[PDB]
Amino acid sequence: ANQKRITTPYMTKYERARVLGTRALQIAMCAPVMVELEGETDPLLIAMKELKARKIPIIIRRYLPDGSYEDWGVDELIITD
Template identity: 80%
Template sequence: MADEDYNEMDMGYEDEPIEPEVEEGAEEDVDNNNNEDVPDPLMAETEEKEEQESVERRRKTSKYMTKYERARILGTRALQISMNAPVMVELEGETDPLEVSSLTKTT
């Protein structure tokens, strides 16, 4: 079928209305209304108090890193090194970013 044949067929679709263009600097913040200081009428007072108490409570943590934390740190640093971030340790012929990041961690 040629292009002319498609123009004759009416599929029942209407053209969508054209949205007005927004100029630079005149952006609308309809969705970004931050009303943090306005209390939520659905939240009870007890829920607010419990939320504040959990924030103020002191955390008990270990002074040692878990294997997951260590893997995340080494992986992040290896990614940085692979994207040409400066290396802060002397290299001894290592080319693998993960090896270099583990050297950075041990020194």
């Protein structure tokens, strides 16, 4: 699915914030826990821990109803800045 040419070398802020949300649910059910499992060790701040991810090994796939599946690995592009 190499229809990935019509995105700026940045994911959008909406997609990035929502993927942070779904990673929140991931690390908030039991554990996909990552590079530091609970090195940041704090009480009930579920969201504010996986915000510090900076690697995010997961894939997200962005579309258009009259278009195909423009896919994107989180790794292969620049971040919120």
